[PDB]
Amino acid sequence: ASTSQVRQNYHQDSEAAINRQINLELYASYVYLSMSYYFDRDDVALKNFAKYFLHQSHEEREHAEKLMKLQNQRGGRIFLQDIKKPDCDDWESGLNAMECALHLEKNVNQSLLELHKLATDKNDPHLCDFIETHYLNEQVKAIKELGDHVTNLRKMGAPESGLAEYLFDKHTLG
Amino acid sequence: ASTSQVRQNYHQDSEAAINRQINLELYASYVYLSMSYYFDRDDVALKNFAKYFLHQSHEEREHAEKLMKLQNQRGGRIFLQDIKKPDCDDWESGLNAMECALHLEKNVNQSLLELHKLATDKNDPHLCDFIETHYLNEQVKAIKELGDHVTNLRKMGAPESGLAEYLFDKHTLG
Amino acid sequence: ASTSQVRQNYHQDSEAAINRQINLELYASYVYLSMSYYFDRDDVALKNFAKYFLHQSHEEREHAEKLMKLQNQRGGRIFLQDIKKPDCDDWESGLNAMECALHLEKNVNQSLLELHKLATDKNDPHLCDFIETHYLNEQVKAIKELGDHVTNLRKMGAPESGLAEYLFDKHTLG
Amino acid sequence: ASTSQVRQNYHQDSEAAINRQINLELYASYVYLSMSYYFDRDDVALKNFAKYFLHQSHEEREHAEKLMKLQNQRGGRIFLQDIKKPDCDDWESGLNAMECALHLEKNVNQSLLELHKLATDKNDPHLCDFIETHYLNEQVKAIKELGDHVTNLRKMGAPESGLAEYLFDKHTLG
Amino acid sequence: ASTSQVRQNYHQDSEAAINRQINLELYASYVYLSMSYYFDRDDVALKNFAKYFLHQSHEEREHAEKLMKLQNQRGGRIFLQDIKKPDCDDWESGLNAMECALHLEKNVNQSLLELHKLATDKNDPHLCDFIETHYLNEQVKAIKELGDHVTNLRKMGAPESGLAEYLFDKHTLG
Amino acid sequence: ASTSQVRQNYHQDSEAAINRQINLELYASYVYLSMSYYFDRDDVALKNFAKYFLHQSHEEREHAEKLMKLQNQRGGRIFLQDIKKPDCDDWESGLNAMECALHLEKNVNQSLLELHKLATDKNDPHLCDFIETHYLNEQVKAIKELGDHVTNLRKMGAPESGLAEYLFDKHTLG
């Protein structure tokens, strides 16, 4: 009950915000897992879409683990919640999955910006630096990459052109 | 809606049982993740317990992925549910975590034996072979290893002896 | 006209400030280019001064390119202006060029500090981290190096001693 | 004020023409820089167009530096002017950028042919050889390459076909 | 007396705070030096405790040197004070030394957080980034490691169990 | 309180003299540290003077550590005092720093000769051999090197000639 021997300048509200961010990162890992195996279906059959989203799934589990490490490093206590099944919808196409991923990463970035605003308000420069170093530029690069992918698929004629998704699978994700 | 072009000798009940087993494997990955970071806390501080359970967590995510591949290979459709937060309790000690892991793996094995009985009842030898090849002996080895670990910790004087858990961490999990 | 699909927490004023900083970095590349070839003249003939300033010129073009990448990563639109010819004056000596470079880098640093104050005012932690990571310490090291060079040239007897500039060229810039 | 000790058979008009050519080469570097980052935008997203034009930008800066070296080698004095922002227009498409580049390189070649006619009129065989050796065939190869690129993009169905620009990006510029 | 040629956006109060932090880092190096040689005594004789604290001593001297470099880089003037002999007390045991080290590192971290609050108040983003990059996470990792060590020693039965300190020396610090 | 089990032929007065010599070696490390960073200032800017004195600082910390080892080897008890800030004065020039270092090393040598006279008076041949083996010739070589450096700087025209200190920095300390 009494304080962690390591805890210093770590607000209860920051501790709770980090637990919510852990859940969000595990949720993002689950969304990309579901998206991956959609492209593995025999009636979709785009293997590089499947590999691309599995890699993204594995990266989100690493992002969750790094926040669980941070919680312990600062003397906070991890509190886990259910990982909700993916919302987005039935995946429909390579383009629609890429658009769901863009929205997911823009929602994760908004959560991280709220987390950074709280750490700023509580004058926690270690937590500010943590978020900036490990999360904020990774989100900007992820969002830019997904926007690039959505643009190419749209220009190529997706989702109507099954040829467009096939050739994007080989040339961009291959 | 209409049948997958690949589907052959794959009962609707088998398809549903495989989706339930996917959820159970993701749940087991989550239980071991939680257990891992407990041992990373500054007031527990057993780093080889933490690494041992993280590795086990990563192995369960691989077990889930292999069942999602199987579902697609057979022309079934993956249906995901929420991943429940870990039940077990507050982890308390290295011994108590090992005992929770033993119970978890004995519950996963019972699920797989029920799955095998269903595949047997539906005369699905491919699914029987899948379960036997990739799951049943992995469960028997996991259960035997966790029983060995629980025995050693008990003989060494855990959970009262903090020396016992420390030296087990170095010599068995190190 | 309508918003970039990637744009998030990126103020119009930040977007414009980044375009002004791009112009300033290209201007700094031009100042160092001019300084370089002054030392290549047959009546100046200090080859290590020439190489030192050419390298500095190439570094400023890289600094401009990284800001053009950032503008696109954040969903801003690059707006280019004329690159003004160098102001400073006729270069006169190794010491006078080093003093012009010190003033240039102290003016670029003041621009970057104003840019950081704007990003702080608009609560853009990604842009704050970008400036701190890629620009602020590079400016402090550049300013310290140029101050060191100016000090040595002054102590050695420059600009009157042509021997001083010759031996500095060989021993410090060689 | 008085003559460079190295100057021999180098007409004042040649000296001035070389300074104008320096400005034109820096302007061409700026045009290709702008074109490069257009293709880096999230709503254009053709990375090999972007790399192709950045390389061309870097080559034009080298062409400018070689003329600044020549000016000093002959005992002329470098005189720099503002580098104008790119004219061409909004870039619109891969085809339109390639067409702007073709017009740019045909304007640079006309400048170099005028420069060669002046050196011929002033009986400066060193300057004639300089232009022929380092510039004239580089312009003919650049113009031929850009014409080839424009032809392919037109035959492939650009600019209407976003598929055409995508596949040209992978197969020709990749 | 008059201003350093390099000084820009570096408040007199920041300059003084950096000199106080230099003294604190040298004091921390001295505390760990004293602790090291305690464990080298023939009536204590724990060689891995001795090596662990000597390494920590050498790391604190590096932390002091990096702040003396920063002071010069920013155009401040180093002002040195006596390095006080270690306070803590007679070292008594491996556990008591580890507890003194935990308190030392939590006092150094509080000094660095006060330093960061001053740099924030004076809008010095270069100094904020310096502290965050080189100091704040190094303090969080140091504090977490020392808390882990204190926990293990307590669980193992230290300081009463001389066996506990012996086996910790071999297995954790060895 | 009672005697160390290892103590043999080690006089209380020798024990106290060794503690005073430890303080003197730490003081010499501090003097050279201060001298080092003086030459790192932007208005002094002699980098090989700075490296030379930092190396000397690191060597004095090693000399202190070896005496703390000796104290324990002989069964004496280390007693630490404050490390006084450097006396010498404001450093002024490369020559003045070298002259302060010569005086420092001649004061350390006089302390060691007094220490050797005490060990001789107490018939401690182990301590006599320790001082002769590890300290006395290191002091004679240090004093000879600093005298050589002072001579060269004086002959070269230091401290008036800033050229002299610059060229000594490159050729002797480089």
Ligand SMILES: [Cl-]
């Ligand atoms: Cl509190």
Ligand SMILES: [Cl-]
């Ligand atoms: Cl919580």
Ligand SMILES: [Cl-]
């Ligand atoms: Cl929940």
Ligand SMILES: [Cl-]
């Ligand atoms: Cl980046």
Ligand SMILES: [Cl-]
């Ligand atoms: Cl059927």
Ligand SMILES: [Cl-]
């Ligand atoms: Cl189902």
Ligand SMILES: [Cl-]
């Ligand atoms: Cl559900």
Ligand SMILES: [Cl-]
């Ligand atoms: Cl087996």
Ligand SMILES: [Cl-]
């Ligand atoms: Cl053991």
Ligand SMILES: [Cl-]
């Ligand atoms: Cl062992």
Ligand SMILES: [Cl-]
């Ligand atoms: Cl808005």
Ligand SMILES: [Cl-]
């Ligand atoms: Cl603008």
Ligand SMILES: [Cl-]
């Ligand atoms: Cl303009």
Ligand SMILES: [Cl-]
């Ligand atoms: Cl640095």
Ligand SMILES: [Cl-]
């Ligand atoms: Cl003439």
Ligand SMILES: [Cl-]
């Ligand atoms: Cl001209």
